[PDB]
Amino acid sequence: APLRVYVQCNPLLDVSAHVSDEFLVKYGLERGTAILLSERQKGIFDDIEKMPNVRYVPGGSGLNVARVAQWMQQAYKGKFVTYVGCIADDRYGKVLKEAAEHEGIVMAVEHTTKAGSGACAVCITGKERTLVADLGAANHLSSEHMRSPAVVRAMDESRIFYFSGFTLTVDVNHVLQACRKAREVDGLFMINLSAPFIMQFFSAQLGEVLPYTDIIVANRHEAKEFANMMKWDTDCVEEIARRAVSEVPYTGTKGRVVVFTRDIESTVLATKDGVETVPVPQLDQDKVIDMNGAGDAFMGGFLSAYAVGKDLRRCCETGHYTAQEVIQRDPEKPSFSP
Ligand SMILES: Nc1ncnc2c1ncn2[C@@H]1O[C@H](COP(=O)(O)OP(=O)(O)OP(=O)(O)OP(=O)(O)OP(=O)(O)OC[C@H]2O[C@@H](n3cnc4c(N)ncnc43)[C@H](O)[C@@H]2O)[C@@H](O)[C@H]1O
Ligand code: NA
């Protein structure tokens, strides 16, 4: 029976379409990056929606992670992951809540009338996806909600706490509440770095949370951006991981773990005990489809194995399995267990 997992992020509906390179130029976008919607992107949602074959699917980084983790523990629907974020009681909000609850996630979400539920433009150019997130309701997640009975109950019963780095743009204090709770319950606190812009523009917030963070998960690019933020003169992912273990402030007792994924190259796994690499199983690249990304899916599999007490390398193997499944989607039960 898996340990209970608490996930917090921004629940967003993904609005996905294939766009031209000129579409990216028009909107001031850098291919393959994620940003928050700004005035520079005025009109982008109307434009993408006016297209053929646009898709509307529940998204949000942490909600993706929660759904992949729950998919790996289907005997524990209602009894495994609780997700916290803020939505409106609108069409998008109802769909995000329904998809997650149908899958067995407990959706301890706030409702606001201050903005409509968030959405993310997912602009697909060949093999790459460029993401523009309009948080809407997600940016209004309140301290009142964080102290509400449903949320405190969920935190009290959970032993693994996962926040996306994307939460750092809302209110760092919400994150710190979970950081302190993880200590209270002798649990684990984990964050993903989410995007280079987190390190570029939310470094103060990230700095507040890192000392309380047991496991830091990122990809190759975010690891290099983290090195840049730290002023570390290295692009060596193994070395960046080594230094994030021992040089980034840490006040916990569970042990600091750093996990940096490298797409087809091996995943870097570091602890006080040393640095290892975990190979990614060979996959025919003609099976990799341009629909889904791999990062949240990796994190979902990682948490599904961590929750049942598997060693760190096995957690990585499980994340590779789930990531490889998700990127091949154009599937009822997993064919791999931690
Ligand atoms: N402000 C915000 N707030 C909240 N949500 C927000 C937000 N902004 C955007 N979002 C949300 O973000 C979601 C999309 O997130 P996500 O699903 O994570 O997609 P992504 O961010 O585009 O991730 P990448 O595909 O680039 O993966 P990665 O670089 O992290 O992993 P890696 O390549 O190392 O690969 C990892 C592993 O996968 C496997 N793998 C990957 N590629 C291959 C390959 N080609 N062949 C074999 N294995 C592979 C390997 O095992 C590897 O270790 C959307 O739903 C959106 O709503
Ligand atoms: Na991601």
Residue numbers in the entry: 4 to 333, 338 to 345
From the paper:
Adenosine kinase (EC 2.7.1.20, ATP:adenosine 5′-phosphotransferase) catalyzes the phosphorylation of adenosine to adenosine monophosphate (AMP) in presence of Mg2+ and utilizing ATP as the preferred phosphoryl donor. The overall structures of both TbrAK in complex with AP5A and compound 1 contain a mixed fold and consist of 12 α-helices and 14 β-strands that form two distinct domains. A common property of adenosine kinases from various organisms is their control via substrate-inhibition to prevent non-physiologically high intracellular purine nucleotide levels, and recently it has been shown that TbrAK activity is strongly inhibited by its substrate adenosine.
The two molecules (A and B) found in the asymmetric unit were not related by proper non-crystallographic symmetry and exhibited a mixed hydrophilic/hydrophobic contact interface typical for crystal contacts. The bisubstrate inhibitor AP5A was co-crystallized with TbrAK which adopts the closed conformation in presence of this compound. The electron density of AP5A was clearly resolved in the structure and provides a detailed view into the adenosine and the ATP binding site. AP5A exhibits an extensive hydrogen bonding pattern with the protein either through direct or water-mediated interactions. The adenosine part of AP5A in the ATP-binding pocket shows hydrogen bonds to the side chains of Q288 (to the free NH2 group of adenine) and Q327 (to a nitrogen atom of the pyrimidine ring of adenine), and the ribose moiety is stabilized by backbone interactions with D266 and T270.
